[PDB]
Amino acid sequence: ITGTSTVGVGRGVLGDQKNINTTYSTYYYLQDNTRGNGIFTYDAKYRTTLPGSLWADADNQFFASYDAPAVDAHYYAGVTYDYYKNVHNRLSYDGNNAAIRSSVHYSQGYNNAFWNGSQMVYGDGDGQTFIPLSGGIDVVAHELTHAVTDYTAGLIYQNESGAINEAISDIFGTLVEFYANKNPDWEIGEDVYTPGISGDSLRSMSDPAKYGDPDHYSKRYTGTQDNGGVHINSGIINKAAYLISQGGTHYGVSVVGIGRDKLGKIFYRALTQYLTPTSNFSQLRAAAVQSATDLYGSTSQEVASVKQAFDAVGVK
Ligand SMILES: [Ca+2]
Ligand SMILES: [Ca+2]
Ligand SMILES: [Ca+2]
Ligand SMILES: [Cl-]
Ligand SMILES: [Cl-]
Ligand SMILES: [Cl-]
Ligand SMILES: [Cl-]
Ligand SMILES: [Cl-]
Ligand SMILES: [Zn+2]
Ligand SMILES: [Zn+2]
Ligand SMILES: [Zn+2]
Ligand SMILES: [Zn+2]
Ligand SMILES: [Zn+2]
Ligand SMILES: [Zn+2]
Ligand SMILES: [Zn+2]
Ligand SMILES: [Zn+2]
Ligand SMILES: [Zn+2]
């Protein structure tokens, strides 16, 4: 809508206060004019009709319980935009400043969130498995990263390619969470999963086997469930990424960590320049080695650590 750019204030899903970019035209709308072609957040009103109504608020204060998922969807879309722009010189998910549109209060008791090809969609959870899913910055950025992948490599969502697709979204979801300094960690979805249980998450990148997920290629799932193990086998790549950044010794292989920024640069270059729709784990290794070579040189520590990390998780 047309109006005046304003800054409102509200509280997110976890009760934290934050400022949000809004637009004033009689009402204050969750329309951020400061990022690309805009960030727009919508009320789906517990329906499954999308996108719903552009979020309108009478006073630019967003402290109602019903407001909280919208505050976080809007704010964390903005943080994700800022990450890709400031760290990777990428303008929105398509690199062409596409508007980022999000709908909250999707359906009733809905324990999921997803990028649907044109917008983000967030359930509120059932209050036991999940609280509203936009409360997790890593969830928001994980799903928006699926759009990045779709607009670059086009990784197929099945089998090893699909596990790479998932792991890329976990890697950049995590890197966004660190970029924001929003209680960062190497676990996924901890801020919105099981409010009655502290210390858990959907999966761990630093220790996938904490939740039973494989941390080595020899332990990969080979059946047909979960589209051929896309959220299961992602642990193999997630652990390699963790090792590249943080270092460690894994199945006896010592990895010299090179930090988060270099992890992100290596994997962003691999994703955008080298991966293809059917890349497998071995091809991802090659893409990451080539990317680190492009950036740091073939004789660099960075290249040596990429190789170490993929050796540690059994990916040749
Ligand atoms: Ca209000
Ligand atoms: Ca996390
Ligand atoms: Ca929990
Ligand atoms: Cl460990
Ligand atoms: Cl381990
Ligand atoms: Cl480790
Ligand atoms: Cl180990
Ligand atoms: Cl190699
Ligand atoms: Zn998803
Ligand atoms: Zn995903
Ligand atoms: Zn966290
Ligand atoms: Zn699990
Ligand atoms: Zn798992
Ligand atoms: Zn799954
Ligand atoms: Zn998923
Ligand atoms: Zn280990
Ligand atoms: Zn370890």
Side-chain angles (χ1 to χ4, degrees), residues 241-312:
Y242 169 82
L243 289 165
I244 292 167
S245 180
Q246 298 308 110
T249 301
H250 184 57
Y251 291 93
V253 175
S254 292
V255 187
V256 176
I258 66 178
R260 291 180 310 274
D261 189 61
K262 290 177 179 178
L263 171 70
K265 286 166 160 48
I266 293 164
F267 273 68
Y268 183 80
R269 179 166 188 83
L271 178 65
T272 61
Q273 304 303 305
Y274 292 118
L275 294 181
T276 74
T278 71
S279 295
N280 68 23
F281 285 6
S282 175
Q283 293 168 317
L284 171 65
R285 172 188 175 132
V289 169
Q290 184 62 54
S291 296
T293 294
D294 298 344
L295 291 167
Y296 303 111
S298 69
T299 61
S300 68
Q301 180 63 68
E302 288 85 355
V303 167
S305 293
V306 174
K307 298 179 175 166
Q308 290 164 354
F310 280 93
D311 281 353

Coordinates of all heavy atoms in Angstrom, one line a residue, residues 241-312:
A241 N 29.8 -29.2 7.9 CA 29.8 -27.7 8.0 C 30.2 -27.2 9.4 O 31.0 -26.3 9.5 CB 28.4 -27.1 7.6
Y242 N 29.7 -27.8 10.4 CA 30.0 -27.4 11.8 C 31.5 -27.6 11.9 O 32.2 -26.7 12.5 CB 29.3 -28.3 12.8 CG 29.8 -28.2 14.2 CD1 29.4 -27.1 15.0 CD2 30.8 -29.1 14.6 CE1 30.0 -27.0 16.2 CE2 31.3 -28.9 15.9 CZ 30.9 -27.9 16.7 OH 31.5 -27.7 17.9
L243 N 32.1 -28.7 11.5 CA 33.5 -29.0 11.6 C 34.3 -27.9 10.8 O 35.4 -27.4 11.4 CB 33.9 -30.4 11.1 CG 33.4 -31.5 12.0 CD1 33.5 -32.8 11.3 CD2 34.2 -31.5 13.3
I244 N 34.0 -27.6 9.6 CA 34.7 -26.6 8.9 C 34.7 -25.3 9.6 O 35.8 -24.6 9.7 CB 34.0 -26.3 7.5 CG1 34.2 -27.6 6.6 CG2 34.6 -25.1 6.8 CD1 33.4 -27.6 5.4
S245 N 33.6 -24.9 10.3 CA 33.6 -23.6 11.0 C 34.3 -23.7 12.3 O 35.2 -22.9 12.6 CB 32.1 -23.2 11.3 OG 32.1 -22.0 12.0
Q246 N 33.9 -24.7 13.2 CA 34.3 -24.7 14.6 C 35.5 -25.6 14.8 O 36.1 -25.6 15.9 CB 33.2 -25.2 15.4 CG 32.0 -24.2 15.4 CD 32.3 -22.8 15.6 OE1 32.3 -21.9 14.7 NE2 32.7 -22.5 16.9
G247 N 35.9 -26.5 13.9 CA 36.9 -27.5 14.1 C 36.4 -28.6 15.0 O 35.4 -28.6 15.6
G248 N 37.3 -29.6 15.1 CA 37.1 -30.7 16.0 C 37.6 -32.0 15.5 O 38.2 -32.0 14.4
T249 N 37.6 -33.1 16.3 CA 38.0 -34.4 15.8 C 36.8 -35.3 15.8 O 36.0 -35.3 16.7 CB 39.1 -34.9 16.8 OG1 40.2 -34.0 16.8 CG2 39.5 -36.3 16.3
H250 N 36.6 -35.9 14.6 CA 35.4 -36.6 14.4 C 35.7 -37.9 13.6 O 36.4 -37.9 12.6 CB 34.4 -35.7 13.5 CG 33.1 -36.3 13.3 ND1 32.2 -36.7 14.3 CD2 32.4 -36.6 12.1 CE1 31.1 -37.2 13.8 NE2 31.2 -37.1 12.4
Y251 N 35.3 -39.0 14.2 CA 35.7 -40.4 13.7 C 37.2 -40.3 13.4 O 37.8 -40.9 12.4 CB 35.0 -40.8 12.5 CG 33.5 -41.1 12.7 CD1 32.5 -40.2 12.6 CD2 33.1 -42.4 13.2 CE1 31.2 -40.5 12.9 CE2 31.8 -42.7 13.5 CZ 30.8 -41.7 13.4 OH 29.5 -42.1 13.6
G252 N 38.0 -39.7 14.4 CA 39.4 -39.8 14.3 C 40.1 -38.8 13.4 O 41.3 -38.8 13.3
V253 N 39.3 -38.0 12.7 CA 39.9 -37.1 11.7 C 39.8 -35.7 12.4 O 38.7 -35.3 12.8 CB 39.1 -37.1 10.4 CG1 39.5 -36.0 9.4 CG2 39.1 -38.5 9.8
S254 N 40.9 -35.0 12.4 CA 41.0 -33.7 13.0 C 40.8 -32.6 12.0 O 41.5 -32.7 10.9 CB 42.4 -33.5 13.7 OG 42.4 -34.4 14.8
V255 N 39.9 -31.7 12.3 CA 39.6 -30.6 11.4 C 40.0 -29.3 12.0 O 39.6 -29.1 13.2 CB 38.1 -30.6 11.1 CG1 37.8 -29.6 10.0 CG2 37.6 -32.0 10.6
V256 N 40.7 -28.5 11.3 CA 41.1 -27.2 11.8 C 40.0 -26.2 11.4 O 39.7 -26.0 10.2 CB 42.4 -26.8 11.1 CG1 42.8 -25.3 11.6 CG2 43.6 -27.7 11.5
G257 N 39.3 -25.7 12.4 CA 38.2 -24.8 12.1 C 38.7 -23.5 11.5 O 39.7 -22.9 12.0
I258 N 37.9 -22.9 10.6 CA 38.2 -21.7 9.9 C 37.1 -20.6 10.2 O 37.3 -19.5 9.7 CB 38.3 -21.9 8.4 CG1 37.0 -22.3 7.7 CG2 39.5 -22.9 8.1 CD1 37.2 -22.5 6.1
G259 N 36.1 -20.9 10.9 CA 35.1 -19.9 11.3 C 33.9 -19.8 10.5 O 33.8 -20.3 9.4
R260 N 32.9 -19.1 11.0 CA 31.6 -19.0 10.4 C 31.6 -18.2 9.1 O 30.9 -18.6 8.1 CB 30.6 -18.5 11.4 CG 30.3 -19.3 12.6 CD 29.2 -18.8 13.6 NE 29.6 -17.4 13.9 CZ 30.5 -17.1 14.9 NH1 31.0 -18.0 15.7 NH2 30.8 -15.8 15.1
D261 N 32.3 -17.1 9.0 CA 32.2 -16.3 7.8 C 32.7 -17.1 6.6 O 32.1 -17.1 5.5 CB 33.0 -15.0 8.0 CG 32.8 -14.1 6.9 OD1 31.6 -13.6 6.6 OD2 33.8 -13.8 6.2
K262 N 33.9 -17.8 6.8 CA 34.4 -18.5 5.7 C 33.5 -19.7 5.4 O 33.4 -20.1 4.2 CB 35.9 -18.9 6.0 CG 36.8 -17.7 6.0 CD 38.2 -18.1 6.5 CE 39.1 -16.9 6.4 NZ 40.5 -17.3 6.9
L263 N 33.0 -20.4 6.4 CA 32.0 -21.5 6.1 C 30.9 -20.9 5.1 O 30.6 -21.5 4.1 CB 31.4 -22.0 7.3 CG 30.2 -23.0 7.1 CD1 30.7 -24.3 6.5 CD2 29.4 -23.2 8.4
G264 N 30.4 -19.8 5.5 CA 29.3 -19.2 4.7 C 29.7 -18.9 3.3 O 28.9 -19.1 2.4
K265 N 30.9 -18.3 3.2 CA 31.3 -17.9 1.9 C 31.6 -19.1 1.0 O 31.2 -19.1 -0.2 CB 32.6 -17.1 1.9 CG 32.4 -15.6 2.5 CD 33.7 -15.0 2.8 CE 33.8 -13.5 2.9 NZ 32.7 -12.9 3.6
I266 N 32.2 -20.2 1.5 CA 32.4 -21.4 0.8 C 31.1 -22.0 0.3 O 31.0 -22.4 -0.8 CB 33.3 -22.3 1.6 CG1 34.7 -21.7 1.8 CG2 33.4 -23.7 0.9 CD1 35.6 -22.3 2.9
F267 N 30.2 -22.2 1.2 CA 29.0 -22.9 0.9 C 28.1 -22.0 0.0 O 27.3 -22.5 -0.9 CB 28.2 -23.4 2.1 CG 28.7 -24.7 2.6 CD1 29.9 -24.9 3.1 CD2 27.9 -25.8 2.4 CE1 30.4 -26.2 3.4 CE2 28.3 -27.1 2.8 CZ 29.5 -27.3 3.3
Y268 N 28.1 -20.7 0.2 CA 27.3 -19.8 -0.7 C 27.8 -19.9 -2.1 O 27.0 -20.0 -3.1 CB 27.2 -18.4 -0.2 CG 26.4 -17.5 -1.0 CD1 25.0 -17.5 -0.9 CD2 27.0 -16.7 -2.0 CE1 24.2 -16.7 -1.7 CE2 26.2 -15.9 -2.8 CZ 24.8 -15.9 -2.6 OH 23.9 -15.1 -3.4
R269 N 29.1 -19.9 -2.3 CA 29.7 -20.0 -3.6 C 29.4 -21.4 -4.2 O 29.1 -21.5 -5.4 CB 31.2 -19.7 -3.6 CG 31.9 -19.9 -4.9 CD 33.3 -19.2 -4.9 NE 33.9 -19.2 -6.2 CZ 33.6 -18.2 -7.1 NH1 32.8 -17.2 -6.8 NH2 34.2 -18.3 -8.3
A270 N 29.5 -22.4 -3.4 CA 29.2 -23.7 -3.9 C 27.8 -23.8 -4.4 O 27.5 -24.3 -5.5 CB 29.4 -24.8 -2.9
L271 N 26.9 -23.3 -3.6 CA 25.4 -23.3 -3.9 C 25.1 -22.6 -5.2 O 24.4 -23.1 -6.1 CB 24.6 -22.7 -2.8 CG 23.1 -22.7 -3.0 CD1 22.5 -24.1 -3.1 CD2 22.4 -21.9 -1.9
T272 N 25.7 -21.4 -5.3 CA 25.3 -20.5 -6.4 C 26.1 -20.7 -7.7 O 25.6 -20.3 -8.8 CB 25.4 -19.0 -6.0 OG1 26.8 -18.7 -5.6 CG2 24.5 -18.7 -4.9
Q273 N 27.3 -21.2 -7.6 CA 28.1 -21.4 -8.8 C 28.3 -22.8 -9.3 O 28.4 -23.0 -10.5 CB 29.6 -20.9 -8.5 CG 29.6 -19.5 -8.1 CD 28.9 -18.5 -9.1 OE1 29.3 -18.5 -10.2 NE2 27.9 -17.8 -8.6
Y274 N 28.2 -23.8 -8.4 CA 28.7 -25.2 -8.7 C 27.6 -26.2 -8.6 O 27.6 -27.2 -9.4 CB 29.9 -25.5 -7.9 CG 31.1 -24.7 -8.3 CD1 31.8 -23.9 -7.4 CD2 31.6 -24.8 -9.6 CE1 32.9 -23.1 -7.7 CE2 32.8 -24.0 -9.9 CZ 33.4 -23.2 -9.0 OH 34.5 -22.5 -9.4
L275 N 26.7 -26.2 -7.6 CA 25.8 -27.3 -7.4 C 24.8 -27.3 -8.6 O 24.5 -26.2 -9.2 CB 25.0 -27.1 -6.0 CG 26.0 -27.4 -4.8 CD1 25.2 -27.3 -3.6 CD2 26.7 -28.7 -4.9
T276 N 24.2 -28.4 -8.9 CA 23.2 -28.7 -9.9 C 22.0 -29.4 -9.2 O 22.1 -29.8 -8.0 CB 23.7 -29.5 -11.0 OG1 23.9 -30.8 -10.6 CG2 25.1 -29.0 -11.4
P277 N 20.9 -29.6 -9.9 CA 19.7 -30.2 -9.3 C 20.0 -31.6 -8.7 O 19.3 -31.9 -7.7 CB 18.7 -30.3 -10.4 CG 19.1 -29.0 -11.2 CD 20.6 -29.0 -11.3
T278 N 20.9 -32.4 -9.2 CA 21.1 -33.7 -8.8 C 22.4 -33.9 -8.1 O 22.9 -35.1 -7.9 CB 21.0 -34.8 -9.9 OG1 22.1 -34.7 -10.8 CG2 19.7 -34.6 -10.6
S279 N 23.1 -32.8 -7.6 CA 24.4 -33.0 -6.9 C 24.2 -34.0 -5.7 O 23.2 -33.9 -5.0 CB 24.9 -31.7 -6.4 OG 25.2 -30.8 -7.4
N280 N 25.1 -34.9 -5.6 CA 25.2 -35.8 -4.5 C 26.3 -35.3 -3.5 O 26.9 -34.3 -3.6 CB 25.4 -37.3 -4.9 CG 26.7 -37.5 -5.6 OD1 27.7 -36.8 -5.3 ND2 26.8 -38.5 -6.4
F281 N 26.4 -36.1 -2.4 CA 27.3 -35.6 -1.3 C 28.7 -35.5 -1.9 O 29.5 -34.5 -1.5 CB 27.3 -36.6 -0.1 CG 26.1 -36.5 0.7 CD1 25.0 -35.8 0.4 CD2 26.1 -37.2 1.9 CE1 23.9 -35.7 1.3 CE2 25.0 -37.2 2.8 CZ 23.9 -36.5 2.5
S282 N 29.2 -36.4 -2.7 CA 30.6 -36.4 -3.2 C 30.7 -35.2 -4.1 O 31.8 -34.5 -4.1 CB 30.8 -37.7 -4.0 OG 32.0 -37.7 -4.7
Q283 N 29.7 -34.8 -4.9 CA 29.7 -33.6 -5.7 C 29.7 -32.4 -4.9 O 30.3 -31.4 -5.3 CB 28.6 -33.7 -6.7 CG 28.8 -34.9 -7.7 CD 27.6 -35.2 -8.6 OE1 26.5 -35.2 -8.2 NE2 27.9 -35.4 -9.9
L284 N 28.9 -32.3 -3.8 CA 29.0 -31.2 -2.9 C 30.5 -31.0 -2.3 O 31.0 -29.9 -2.2 CB 28.0 -31.4 -1.7 CG 28.2 -30.3 -0.6 CD1 27.9 -28.9 -1.1 CD2 27.3 -30.7 0.6
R285 N 31.1 -32.1 -2.0 CA 32.5 -32.0 -1.5 C 33.3 -31.3 -2.6 O 34.1 -30.4 -2.3 CB 33.1 -33.3 -1.1 CG 34.6 -33.3 -0.8 CD 35.2 -34.6 -0.7 NE 36.6 -34.5 -0.5 CZ 37.3 -35.1 0.5 NH1 36.8 -35.9 1.4 NH2 38.7 -34.8 0.5
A286 N 33.2 -31.8 -3.8 CA 34.0 -31.2 -4.9 C 33.7 -29.7 -5.1 O 34.6 -28.9 -5.3 CB 33.8 -31.9 -6.2
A287 N 32.4 -29.4 -5.0 CA 32.0 -28.0 -5.1 C 32.5 -27.1 -4.0 O 32.9 -26.0 -4.3 CB 30.5 -27.9 -5.1
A288 N 32.5 -27.6 -2.8 CA 33.1 -26.9 -1.7 C 34.6 -26.7 -1.8 O 35.1 -25.7 -1.5 CB 32.7 -27.5 -0.4
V289 N 35.3 -27.8 -2.2 CA 36.7 -27.7 -2.4 C 37.1 -26.7 -3.5 O 38.0 -25.9 -3.3 CB 37.3 -29.1 -2.7 CG1 38.8 -29.0 -3.2 CG2 37.2 -30.0 -1.5
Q290 N 36.3 -26.7 -4.6 CA 36.6 -25.8 -5.7 C 36.3 -24.4 -5.2 O 37.0 -23.4 -5.5 CB 35.8 -26.1 -6.9 CG 36.1 -25.2 -8.1 CD 37.5 -25.3 -8.6 OE1 37.9 -26.4 -8.9 NE2 38.3 -24.2 -8.6
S291 N 35.2 -24.2 -4.5 CA 34.8 -22.9 -4.0 C 35.9 -22.3 -3.1 O 36.2 -21.1 -3.2 CB 33.5 -22.9 -3.3 OG 32.4 -23.2 -4.1
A292 N 36.4 -23.1 -2.1 CA 37.4 -22.7 -1.2 C 38.7 -22.4 -2.0 O 39.5 -21.5 -1.7 CB 37.7 -23.7 -0.1
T293 N 39.0 -23.2 -3.0 CA 40.1 -22.9 -3.9 C 40.0 -21.6 -4.6 O 41.0 -20.8 -4.6 CB 40.3 -24.1 -4.9 OG1 40.6 -25.3 -4.3 CG2 41.4 -23.8 -6.0
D294 N 38.9 -21.3 -5.2 CA 38.6 -20.0 -5.8 C 38.8 -18.8 -4.9 O 39.4 -17.8 -5.3 CB 37.1 -19.9 -6.3 CG 36.8 -20.9 -7.4 OD1 37.7 -21.5 -8.0 OD2 35.5 -21.1 -7.6
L295 N 38.4 -19.0 -3.6 CA 38.4 -17.9 -2.7 C 39.7 -17.7 -2.0 O 40.1 -16.6 -1.6 CB 37.3 -18.1 -1.6 CG 35.8 -18.0 -2.1 CD1 34.8 -18.5 -1.1 CD2 35.5 -16.6 -2.5
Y296 N 40.4 -18.8 -1.6 CA 41.5 -18.8 -0.7 C 42.8 -19.4 -1.3 O 43.9 -19.3 -0.7 CB 41.2 -19.5 0.6 CG 39.9 -18.9 1.3 CD1 38.7 -19.6 1.3 CD2 40.0 -17.6 1.8 CE1 37.6 -19.0 1.8 CE2 38.9 -17.0 2.3 CZ 37.7 -17.6 2.3 OH 36.5 -17.0 2.8
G297 N 42.7 -20.1 -2.4 CA 43.9 -20.7 -3.0 C 43.9 -22.2 -2.8 O 43.6 -22.7 -1.7
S298 N 44.5 -23.0 -3.8 CA 44.5 -24.4 -3.6 C 45.4 -24.9 -2.5 O 45.2 -26.0 -1.9 CB 45.0 -25.0 -4.9 OG 46.4 -24.7 -5.1
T299 N 46.4 -24.1 -2.0 CA 47.3 -24.5 -1.0 C 46.9 -24.0 0.4 O 47.6 -24.2 1.4 CB 48.7 -24.1 -1.2 OG1 48.8 -22.7 -1.3 CG2 49.3 -24.7 -2.5
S300 N 45.7 -23.4 0.5 CA 45.2 -22.7 1.7 C 44.8 -23.7 2.8 O 44.4 -24.9 2.5 CB 44.0 -21.8 1.4 OG 42.9 -22.6 1.0
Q301 N 44.8 -23.2 4.0 CA 44.2 -23.9 5.1 C 42.8 -24.2 4.9 O 42.2 -25.2 5.3 CB 44.4 -23.1 6.4 CG 43.8 -23.8 7.6 CD 44.5 -25.1 7.9 OE1 45.7 -25.1 8.3 NE2 43.8 -26.2 7.8
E302 N 42.1 -23.2 4.3 CA 40.6 -23.3 4.1 C 40.3 -24.5 3.2 O 39.4 -25.3 3.6 CB 40.1 -22.0 3.4 CG 40.1 -20.8 4.4 CD 41.5 -20.1 4.5 OE1 42.5 -20.5 3.9 OE2 41.5 -19.0 5.1
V303 N 41.0 -24.7 2.1 CA 40.8 -25.9 1.3 C 41.2 -27.2 2.1 O 40.4 -28.1 2.1 CB 41.7 -25.8 0.0 CG1 41.8 -27.1 -0.7 CG2 41.1 -24.8 -0.9
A304 N 42.3 -27.2 2.8 CA 42.6 -28.4 3.6 C 41.6 -28.7 4.6 O 41.3 -29.9 4.8 CB 44.0 -28.2 4.3
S305 N 41.0 -27.7 5.3 CA 39.9 -28.0 6.3 C 38.6 -28.5 5.6 O 38.0 -29.3 6.2 CB 39.7 -26.7 7.1 OG 40.8 -26.4 7.9
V306 N 38.2 -28.0 4.5 CA 37.1 -28.6 3.8 C 37.3 -30.0 3.5 O 36.4 -30.9 3.8 CB 36.8 -27.8 2.5 CG1 35.7 -28.5 1.7 CG2 36.4 -26.3 2.8
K307 N 38.5 -30.4 3.0 CA 38.8 -31.8 2.8 C 38.7 -32.6 4.0 O 38.2 -33.8 4.0 CB 40.1 -32.0 2.1 CG 40.3 -31.3 0.7 CD 41.7 -31.5 0.1 CE 41.7 -30.9 -1.3 NZ 43.1 -30.7 -1.8
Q308 N 39.3 -32.1 5.1 CA 39.3 -32.8 6.4 C 37.9 -33.1 6.9 O 37.6 -34.2 7.4 CB 40.0 -31.8 7.5 CG 41.6 -31.6 7.4 CD 42.3 -30.4 8.2 OE1 41.6 -29.5 8.8 NE2 43.6 -30.4 8.1
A309 N 37.1 -32.1 6.8 CA 35.7 -32.2 7.3 C 34.9 -33.2 6.5 O 34.2 -34.0 7.1 CB 35.0 -30.8 7.2
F310 N 35.0 -33.2 5.2 CA 34.3 -34.2 4.5 C 34.9 -35.6 4.6 O 34.2 -36.6 4.7 CB 34.3 -33.9 3.0 CG 33.2 -32.8 2.7 CD1 33.4 -31.5 2.6 CD2 31.9 -33.2 2.4 CE1 32.4 -30.6 2.4 CE2 30.9 -32.3 2.2 CZ 31.2 -31.0 2.2
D311 N 36.3 -35.7 4.8 CA 36.8 -37.0 5.2 C 36.2 -37.5 6.5 O 35.9 -38.7 6.7 CB 38.3 -36.9 5.4 CG 39.1 -37.0 4.1 OD1 38.5 -37.2 3.1 OD2 40.4 -36.8 4.2
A312 N 36.1 -36.6 7.5 CA 35.6 -36.9 8.8 C 34.2 -37.5 8.8 O 33.8 -38.4 9.6 CB 35.6 -35.7 9.8

